Design an enzyme around this catalytic site. Structure first.
Site, PDB file in Angstrom:
ATOM      1  CB  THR A 325       0.575  90.607  15.770  1.00 49.52           C
ATOM      2  OG1 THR A 325       0.622  89.415  14.971  1.00 49.52           O
ATOM      3  CG2 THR A 325       0.503  90.199  17.256  1.00 49.52           C
ATOM      4  CE1 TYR A 326       1.678  89.296  11.151  1.00 50.37           C
ATOM      5  CE2 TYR A 326       2.859  91.079   9.938  1.00 50.37           C
ATOM      6  CZ  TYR A 326       2.837  89.811  10.509  1.00 50.37           C
ATOM      7  OH  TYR A 326       4.068  89.049  10.412  1.00 50.37           O
TER       8      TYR A 326
END
Lengths: 400, 401, 400, 399
Positions: A325-326
Site C-alpha cells: 500500500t505505499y
DNA sequence: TAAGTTCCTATTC
DNA sequence: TTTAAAAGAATAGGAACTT
DNA sequence: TAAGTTCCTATTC
DNA sequence: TTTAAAAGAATAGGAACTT
DNA sequence: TAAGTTCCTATTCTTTAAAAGAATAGGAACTT
DNA sequence: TAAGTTCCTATTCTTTAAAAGAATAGGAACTT
C-alpha cells in the site's frame, strides 16, 4: 466450458439448481452438484468475493474426485481446501437441513493407498539436472535459444503456428515471463518507450498476472540472427486480436494478445520436436523454459540483481505493507537490462559498465532515421495497436 | 536384509501376507507381522510416501520389541512414533475387522523413585564422552598432530592393504570435508571433477546426494603441504578398492536416474569403528558409544571454532541455517586446510607461507603435459567411472611427486 | 547457609523431614517446608537433575514469600516458576495424600488490579543514558579506568581489600568478564602462552561461568601507568587461595581465585567512592562496569568482531547442534586483541594492522631477557600456581 | 478531552463512579459508563497495564456505539476487541453481581444473504484512492516535481505565516524522512545533533521515541541542491513556531524521564489535512479518507522503489525487518540531490555542479565566535543544541 | 469571511 | 502496524554483626 | 587367529 | 537432524476430435 | 567506628523445545 | 497423417493470516 457456464448462471439460479438436486434424491442429480458445490463453498468462505477461473477449475476437480454420498441417510461429503470445515458444513446444511455434510480438509484408505502403490510398483530434480547439462555444455544461452527457436521452423504444420510458437518462445525469454504474462497482454497498451541504449523499445502491459502484480512486456531490436522486432512482425502478420476471455465470476479489457489454448499446442510441439533432452521429461518445463533460460542468462552473465525485477517476483527487501500500500508504480526493468539482452552491448563485471560492441549498426542512430504505411502492413491490429507503434515496426522492418 | 526384502515384495503381496497371519491365528504367524506392520503404519500416516531404510530399520525394531497380542480376544498392540494413534488403529482394523488394535505412543515421574534415585547418587559414559573430547583438544597436540596420530594408528594394525587404505582414506576424508561416514560413502564416483581454486590451482570435487538431511553437498580432495596429503591417500584408496553398486535405500521403485555406484561399502563403518576402537590411539575412542567414524566431524568443527571461523561451520559441515541447489565451501576454506596458507584474524585473508613450494605453480606444470592418458593405467578399476580428466590429474600429481 | 545445608542433607532425609511437617500439622512446621518444597518441585520438574545455588536461592525466596496454608482443610499453595502446575501438584500429593496443593504460576481479579493501580496512581533507562554520557565525554576509556582504579587507592581500609578491589576491577576490564568469570578461575590452571606481539601472556581458565561455556582469563604486561602484571603481583601477595565453594546439589576443581563475597564489599566500596555519577544510581552497574567499558572500548576502537569472543557470548554463526554436541575447544581470543589492550600497539582500521608504538621498551624483547625464586615471593600460591608462571611474574616484577 | 479526564481520575474513583451508575438504575447514568467500561475492560484483559490514548479513543467509540441495556432485567451488553469474552463478563459481574453482562466480539456470514447479495451484483474504499495514487506518479511530473508543487500549494493559500511555515515544514519533513505525522510531531527537540556523513559533510538528526510501533527512529534535516532545501524550511519553521509541552498520551502516569518537549502540536494535523484537502494541488487529495499528511510517506516509499533502492525502504521508513537502527549514509546523498545513483555500479555519484556540500560545510565549521545562532532562534534557545542553532544560523546567512 | 482549532468518530495502517 | 515469553542463573541491595 | 563382515539392536544427532 | 504449512492460481498432460 | 561480612531478598541478565526421522555405534555369531 | 484443439485433470509454482492495537482522516460546532 463449465466455468464459462457458471459465469453465465445467475446466483439465485445456481443455489436453486443445487437444491433441486436434493428434492428427488437421485444419484444422477447429486453426483453433479460438484461445480455448484464449489461455487457455494467459495462464496461462503469468502463472502461474495468472486472466484477466479483456474481456482474454480482446481477446486471443482478436487470436489468432483472426492464427492461421495448416501441417499438413504442423507449424508454427503467431499474434500476442500479449508480449515474451518465446521463453519462451512453448517452453512451448507441451512441450505438443505434434511442433509448432513462433512467437509474433509484437502491437505486416507489403506486398500486405496496399497493398490496405488501396487500400481507404482509396476512402473522434478531430473529436469533441473538436465537443464544444468543443457547449459553446462557446448553452447551458450543465446545459442540454445536460436536452436529451440529453429526447432519450430520446419516442424510446424501452418505458418500461423510456426509464427506463434517462435514469437511466444522468444517473447517469454526476452521478458522472463510466464505464458500467461505474454498471453494476457492488453494489445491496446502498446507504447514506444525510450531506453538510453537502444533509442526506443516497444512496451505493452499485462495486468491479469499470476500474483496479480501488473508488469510490462517488451520487444526491441536485437543484434544478430535473433531479432525480437522481426518475430513480432511475423506474429502480428499472421495472428489476429483475441477477445479477452472472462476469467472470474463477477460482472474491462476487450482483447488479449494470444489464445489461451496456444500453450497446449505449443507445449505439445516443443515436446515432440524435443530440440533438447530436457523437453522429453514428462512434466518438465515446457512454455516455462523461456523463463528459466533468461534467469540463467542473467546469472551466468553476472546480473542476478535484475532477475527478480525482470521476472516479477514479489520483492522481499521491502516490507509487505510498504509494497502492498505505499508503492504506486509498476517497478521498472532498468534501462541497461535491454541494452544487454539486445546484444548491442556487453557487461563488464569490473568496470560496472555497458560496453557497446563495435557492430556497424548503432541501435540509437538507426532509430533516428526511422523517426525522421503501418496500418497497411498490420491490418488485423489496425485500430487496436497504437498507430505510432505499427509505424515504428513497419518502418524498422522495411528499413532493413 | 529384511529391508531389502521388503523392497522386493509387491505392495498387494505385503498386505496379503499380513492378513493371512490373522486367518489361522498363530503365535508363529502374528509374531512376525513386525516388518509388515511397520510398512503399513508408515504408508498410512504418510499416504504412500516411500520409507527410508534407516527409518524402517529403527521402527521395525521399536515395533518388534513392543509387539504383544491375545489370539483369544483378537487384540494386538505395539509402540510406534506417532501421536494420532486412533487414526492408525482404525485403518489397521479395516484391514482386519475381527481384531482390536492399540498403538501406543513411543514418546509420551514419581517422586519417591526420583528421591531414592537421588538418595542413591548422594552416596556414590555420555557426559564422559564429551569430557574426553574436550580433553583431547585441551591437552598439548594440535588438531593436525592428532589427525596424523589417529591416521597412523591404522598403519601397522590393519590386516590387509585394502583395509589399511580404506581406514586412512575414510578418516582423512571425513576430516577434510567435516562430513559423516555416509557423506563420504554415498558419493557418486561418476561425479568427480577438477574445479578451480585461486589458492591451490585446482581441487577434486565430487557429489553426495543421499545425505542424512537430504541436502546435497560436495566432497573434496586436494593437495596439502606436509606429511598428510589427501591426494596421496586418495591415490592409495583408488588403487585398492573398487566401485560399489549403489544400494537401494528406500521402498520406492525408482529405477530412473539414481547413481549406479557409491564410493565406499556400507559395511566399511563397522570394521572401521571396530578398528578405531581397538587401536584406541586416544582415550576417547575407548568410551562405548563415543564418537568413532564421527570423530573426523567433531575435529573439524572444533578446528573451525578454535581457529575463529565458525561462519564456515554450517556450510562445511552442511547444517541448516532452477539450480539443482547445493552450496559449496568458500575458496579460502581449502586454502587453510591445505596448509599452504595461514589465516590472519586481523585482516581476515589467507596468507601463503614463504615456503618455496607454491601449489598453484605446481598445478601449471601438471596441466601442461596432458595427452599422457596414463591415468587410466594407474587406476584401472575406476577407469570409465571416474572422469579421465581427473584420473590424469591425480596420476600426474602422484608421479610428479 | 541454607543452600549449603540442603547439599549436606540426604535425599531420603529431605523427603522424610518434609513429610513429618504434615503429620502433626503445626504452623511452625509447615511454614518452613519452603527450602524442602523448592528442592522437591525442582527434582520433580527436572527428574533428579541437580539444582544450582543461585537458582535454589531465587526460588526458595519466591516460595517462601508466597507460601500460605490451611491446617484445617489441609490445603497449601505457593508460587513457582512453572507452567505445568497440575503435574507438580499431583506429585506433591502422592507424597502427602491427605493434603491439597495448588501451584500458582510465578511470572486475575479487578478489585486487586484496581487497588494495585490506585496504589501506583499515588507514587534502567537512566543508567544506560548515564553510561553513554560517561563514555561520550572528554576522558578516554583508559583515563576513566585509571581514575576508577585510583578511587580505591586510599579509601580502602586494608591492603588486602585495596589490592582485591584494584585487581578485580582491572581484571574484569582486561577480560571483559563478569565478577564470577574472574572469581571462579581455577588457580591451578595458570599458564604462559605465546603471543606474537607481547612475547607471552598469562592465561588461566574459568569453567563455572553463567552460560556454562568455559573461557580463559588473561594477564599481561601493559605500557603506561596501568599494568596488569603489577596488580596481579600485588594481588597474589596479599590474598590467598580460596576453597572452591560447592554450587550445585551434586565435579572437580579444588580452588577458586577470589572469595564469593568479595563482590558485596567491592560493590559497596565502588558505590561510596563513587568516582563517577553512574556509580551513584541504585542497581546501576557495579562490578559490571568493567565489562561495559571493554565492550565500548572495542566498539569505539572499531573492533566489535572481537567482542563476542572476548566477552564470551553464545556464537550464533553455527547451528546449536554444532555448538552443543560437536564443538570441543574454547574459541580463542585473537592474538591482536591483547596487542591493543596492552597499549604497546595501536589498531589501524584501514591498513588492518597492529602498529607497534615506538616506545623504547619492546614487550617481546623484554620477555626474552626474562626467559633467559618465584616460589619465594608468592608463598601462598606456591604449589598451586604453576612455578613456571610464578617465576615469570616474579622476574618481570623485579626486572622493572 | 475525555481521555485526559480519565487520566486525571484515580483508579478507585473510576470503579467507584462506575458502580454508582448501577445503584439507582438510570438511563442517564448507565448510558455514560462507556469511558469507564473501556478502562475497566482493558485493565482486566491486560492486568493493570496502562492504556494508550488512541486505543482508549478507538475502543471508547466502539463501546459507546454498541452499548445497550435493560434496566428491568439488569442486563447490559456491548462490543469489544476481545476473544475471551466470558472471562471479561465474569470480572464485570463480580463488580456488579446484580447484573448480567454480555461482551460481543468486535470481529465476527449467512449464505442466503451472501447469495442474494451476489444475485444482486450479478445484475448490475481505497479503490478510488489507490487509483489516483497510481495516477499521480503515472503522469508527467517526477517525485521531486510533485513535491515542489504540493509544497507551493500552501505558499499563498495559508492565512498566517506560522501555518504556511508549519504546513511546508511538516510536508517536506515527512517526505525527507518517509515518516508519519506522529514521527515528525513527537520529536524530542532537545535531541538535535549534528552528525557527520561522508557525502554532505553533516546533517541534522533528532530523535522520536513515541512512535506508532514503539520503535524509536531518527528524523533528519539536511542541505539539498535546487529550489527545495530542507534546512531552509527548517529555518522558517524554527523562526515561527515554538516548543510544545509533550502531551500525556497513556494512563501510565509514570513520573520520570519522558521528554518534556515535542516538536509540533498534536492538532497541526487536522488543519494541515484540511488545508491540503482544499488546496487540492492534485486529484488524489480530493478523495475522502485518501492519504493527506501521509502523502509524504507514500512519495518517499515510491521514490525509493522507483529508484531501485527498496533495500533502504524498511530502514528509512521504519518497518519491522530481520541501539535503534539508522539510515545508511548514501540515502541522504541521494535525497539531497547533490548526488545521483548508478544502478549498474551501485554507487552514489556527485553532480559536477560547482557546489559541493562537503566543502561548504568546512567554511561554516571554520569561522566560530558566532553564538549568533541563539539570536536568530530565540524561542528554541536553550532547548535545541546551540551547536545546531549555530550551524543552521550560519548555513542560512552563509547562503 | 473562513482557515484554524477542539474533541470525538470513522478509517486505515 | 505488528508479532519471544520466561525459565534459569547472575549481579545489586538490605541490614544486622564484626572487626 | 583375530581382524573383517553380516545384519540387527541400541544410541545419538 | 530438523523445524512454513497450504491456500490459491499457474503450467503440464491426457485423450478424444478436427482439420 | 564504619568498612567489610553474612545471608537472604530484589533486580537484571542470557538463552530457549519436542519429537518424528535418519544416522552412527555396538553385539554376536560368522568368515576368512 | 498427425499437428493442433478442446476441456478437463494432474503438477508445480508463488506468497502468505487474523485481529488486537495505534495512527491518520473526517464531522460539527466553535474561534481567532
Amino acid at each position: 466450458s463449465q466455468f464459462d457456464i457458471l459465469c453465465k448462471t445467475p446466483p439465485k439460479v445456481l443455489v436453486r439448481q443445487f437444491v433441486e438436486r436434493f428434492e428427488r434424491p437421485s444419484g444422477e442429480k447429486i453426483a453433479s452438484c460438484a461445480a455448484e458445490l464449489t461455487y457455494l463453498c467459495w462464496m461462503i468462505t469468502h463472502n461474495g468475493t468472486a472466484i477466479k477461473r483456474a481456482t474454480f477449475m482446481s477446486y471443482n476437480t478436487i470436489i468432483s474426485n472426492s464427492l461421495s454420498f448416501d441417499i438413504v441417510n442423507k449424508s454427503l461429503q467431499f474434500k476442500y481446501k479449508t480449515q474451518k470445515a465446521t463453519i462451512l458444513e453448517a452453512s451448507l446444511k441451512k441450505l438443505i437441513p434434511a442433509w448432513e455434510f462433512t467437509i474433509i480438509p484437502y491437505n486416507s484408505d489403506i486398500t486405496d493407498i496399497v493398490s496405488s502403490l501396487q500400481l507404482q510398483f509396476e512402473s522434478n530434480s531430473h529436469s533441473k539436472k538436465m537443464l544444468k547439462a543443457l547449459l553446462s555444455e557446448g553452447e551458450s544461452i543465446w545459442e540454445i535459444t536460436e536452436k529451440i527457436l529453429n526447432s519450430f521452423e520446419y516442424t510446424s504444420r501452418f505458418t500461423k503456428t510456426k509464427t506463434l510458437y517462435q514469437f511466444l518462445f522468444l517473447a517469454t525469454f526476452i521478458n522472463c515471463g510466464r505464458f500467461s504474462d505474454i498471453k494476457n497482454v492488453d494489445p491496446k497498451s502498446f507504447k514506444l518507450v525510450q531506453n538510453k541504449y537502444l533509442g526506443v523499445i516497444i512496451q505493452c502491459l499485462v495486468t491479469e498476472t499470476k500474483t496479480s502484480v501488473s508488469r510490462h512486456i517488451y520487444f526491441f531490436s536485437a543484434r544478430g540472427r535473433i531479432d525480437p522486432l522481426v518475430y513480432l512482425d511475423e506474429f502480428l502478420r499472421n495472428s489476429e486480436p483475441v477477445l479477452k476471455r472472462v476469467n472470474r465470476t463477477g460482472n474491462k479489457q476487450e482483447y488479449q494478445l494470444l489464445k489461451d489454448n496456444l500453450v497446449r499446442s505449443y507445449n505439445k510441439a516443443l515436446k515432440k520436436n524435443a530440440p533438447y533432452p530436457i523437453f522429453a521429461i514428462k512434466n518438465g518445463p515446457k512454455s516455462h523454459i523461456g523463463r528459466h533460460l533468461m534467469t540463467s542468462f542473467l546469472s551466468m552473465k553476472g546480473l542476478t540483481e535484475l532477475t527478480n525485477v525482470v521476472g516479477n517476483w514479489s520483492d522481499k527487501r521491502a516490507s509487505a505493507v510498504a509494497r502492498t500500500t505505499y508503492t504506486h508504480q509498476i517497478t521498472a526493468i532498468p534501462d541497461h537490462y535491454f541494452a544487454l539482452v539486445s546484444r548491442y552491448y556487453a557487461y563488464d563485471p569490473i568496470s560496472k559498465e555497458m560496453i557497446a560492441l563495435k557492430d556497424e549498426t548503432n541501435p540509437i542512430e538507426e532509430w533516428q532515421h526511422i523517426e525522421q504505411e503501418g496500418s497497411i502492413r498490420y491490418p488485423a491490429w489496425n485500430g487496436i495497436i497504437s498507430q505510432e507503434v505499427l509505424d515504428y515496426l513497419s518502418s524498422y522492418i522495411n528499413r532493413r
